[PDB]
Amino acid sequence: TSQVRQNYHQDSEAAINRQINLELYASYVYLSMSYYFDRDDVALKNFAKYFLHQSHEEAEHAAKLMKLQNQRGGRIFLQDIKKPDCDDWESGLNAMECALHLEKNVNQSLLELHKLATDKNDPHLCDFIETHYLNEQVKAIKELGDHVTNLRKMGAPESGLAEYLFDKHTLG
Amino acid sequence: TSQVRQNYHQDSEAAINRQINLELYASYVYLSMSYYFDRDDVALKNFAKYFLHQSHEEAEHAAKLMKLQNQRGGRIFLQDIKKPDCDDWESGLNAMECALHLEKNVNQSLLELHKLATDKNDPHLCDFIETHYLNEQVKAIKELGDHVTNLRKMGAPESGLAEYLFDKHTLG
Amino acid sequence: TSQVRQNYHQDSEAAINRQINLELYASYVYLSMSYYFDRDDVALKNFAKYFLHQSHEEAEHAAKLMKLQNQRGGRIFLQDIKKPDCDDWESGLNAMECALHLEKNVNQSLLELHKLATDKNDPHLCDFIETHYLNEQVKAIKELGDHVTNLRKMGAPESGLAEYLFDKHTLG
Amino acid sequence: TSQVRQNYHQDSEAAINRQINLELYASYVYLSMSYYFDRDDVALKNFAKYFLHQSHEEAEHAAKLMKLQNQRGGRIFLQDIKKPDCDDWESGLNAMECALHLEKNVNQSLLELHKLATDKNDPHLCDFIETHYLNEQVKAIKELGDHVTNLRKMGAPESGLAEYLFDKHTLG
Ligand code: NA
Ligand code: NA
Ligand code: NA
Ligand code: NA
């Protein structure tokens, strides 16, 4: 119906809406993590800062998807942003592992979206995904994997000194 | 249980958690409005910009509340961020009226929170609310009322020229 | 025959030549529009400026396609640039609607070109189209749709005041 | 009797004098801690610097209270500044825990002062306490709690390496 809509399948529109909700959910998870590390009984300031930055970045990814939805003449349908799985993330290492799992889940969703766009012969949508989301996800996954490896090698979560020093030296 | 907790009632902690969720919900409503005005069949760029700025400000208010929760030794319990009431906000004037209603609802919640903090003799929480939330809410309500008045006087929503010119001159 | 030619199908070469001609035709249409709004009995300077800028941009798109043709070892075959459909474009709103229709036609041609390049397994040509043409077209279509929406809402073409104010505030 | 005195109860004046003495005592405790960490057999320079800064800040808080006493027409009655409980503070972690306990005691005194001022309907005194003392105390308590948490997690006081690294990385 939109005067600008061209080569934009309804399935693609629906998938974009689902991706918007997933990105908002990921941002909310990161927010929860960030303020977990701000707790007085956790007190890892750079973990909190790292996850807060991640949250803001995820928010921006969601917003970019909404912008695309409008650009292509699709209609944004928002849904509830579900609360994260955990209130207490239990350690820096556990939070990093959960973030890695989350980023891989988002990446899988993006790959499914790219598959759909390819099936619908929507080169603009494919190129948008590749340009703005896929390599960002690969880099994020690599960085989180590096963090997890380093934390495990340093002796986290059992060694509190490990998480303290990782907070200072890697995230600081 | 928190080593930093002092003169922080459990009722106040719960009310702060509810306020956090309300602020996140308000931010989400503003986001929905912003991207409604970004639609090709609405195309009011400065309305979109205004509501996007409002959304970011609300997000920051929520985050400040979470920071307080941690500062006082309370524990943040996040909840689902419900989707906004509307997908289609129908006009600049209607969006402004809905935003006014929303801001007054948030203000009423903040006033109830202040009443609770006064009843619990929590001067720090009272002062926090007064310093960071109450006057901001009064100013926001006044600004939205001004916008609604001007839009109505110009002939919105029936006159599209009114909303166009208000977009340019007041929000631009 | 070209020493540089590699994985460049003759069908792709022919389609590129057709695209070159289409881009030149679009530039010529925009030129006609621009100088229509420069007429003393139309006198919408920023409409003229907008369409002149569009014309120059289209010319540059054509030239970029010719550069690609040479880069890949294809041979440029120019054809007559047909005159635009209209000498008199009748209004700012009508010109914007015609420009929207034209941009969607160019976009459809580009999508067909991308389909051909995908069928011929020419990833370089696909990537060229995606990187330099597809998102530019989506943005142009969105912008024109916004202009059309705003002009219609303001009361164009009947209200001359609408086109005057749109000339000043949006295109100025 | 003072020409400037207005709505300043004698009970409030006495409580302000007691608060002045408490702030001076806290400054003296911090001074003792600071020079404990300057000992050659302790030798934690940034612990010493941190506690010296805390001492100076407490002194300034006391002085601000005296200024208020004069502003409101009360009369300053100084009392002996009692020596701190300990000469030897035994470790960085123990000093931080004692500082946390001290700050919470000062905060409790300030809250009692605010309760008194509210009971006497002295909004100026209430606002003074809220503006200059309450949030400062909350922040100080939160910071000390964070320090205590980090020191405990790193393995202090048993691990001298923990206190050394905390000295360098957090307090440095
Ligand atoms: Na993302
Ligand atoms: Na708010
Ligand atoms: Na073009
Ligand atoms: Na003090």
Author numbering:
A (entry chain V), B (entry chain A), C (entry chain D), D (entry chain F): 5 to 176
The authors write:
As an iron storage and release self-assembling protein cage, wild-type Ftn (wt-Ftn) comprises 24 FTH1 subunits with 12 C2 axes20. With the ultimate objective to create a biocatalysis platform that could be expressed in vivo, we report the rational design of an artificial human ferritin heavy chain (FTH1)-based metalloprotein to achieve histidine-specific aza-Michael addition with α,β-unsaturated chemical moieties. Utilizing the large area the C2 interfaces cover altogether, mutated FTH1 subunits were designed to assemble only upon divalent copper binding at the C2 interfaces hosting their histidine mutations. To still allow these sites and/or structurally induced nearby residues to chelate Cu(II) for catalyzing histidine modifications while allowing the ferritin cage to reserve its self-assembling property, instead of modifying all of the above-mentioned four copper-chelating histidines, we attempted to replace only one (R63) or two (R63/E67), which are noncopper-chelating, with histidine analogs 1–3 (4-thiazolyl-l-alanine, 1; 2-(5-bromothienyl)-l-alanine (BtA), 2; 3-methyl-l-histidine (MeH), 3), separately, via genetic code expansion.
Instate of binding metal, either Fe(II) or Cu(II), at the C2 interface of Ftn-2x-2, 63BtA, 67BtA, and H60 form an aromatic cluster of pi–pi interactions. Conversion rates (CVRs) carried out by Ftn-1x-3 and Ftn-2x-2 with 2 equiv of DEEM were 20% and 33%, respectively, making the latter more desirable for further characterization. For Ftn-2x-2, seven other α,β-unsaturated reagents were tested to modify insulin, yielding CVRs between 0 and 44%. To investigate Ftn-2x-2’s substrate scope as an aza-Michael ligase, we examined its catalytic activity alongside DEEM treatment on seven additional protein substrates that ranged in length from 10 to 607 residues: a luteinizing hormone-releasing hormone analog ([d-Ala6, N-Me-Leu7]-LH-RH), the small ubiquitin-related modifier 1 (SUMO1), lysozyme, human ubiquitin conjugating enzymes UBE2 V2 and UBE2N, superfolder green fluorescent protein (sfGFP), and bovine serum albumin (BSA).
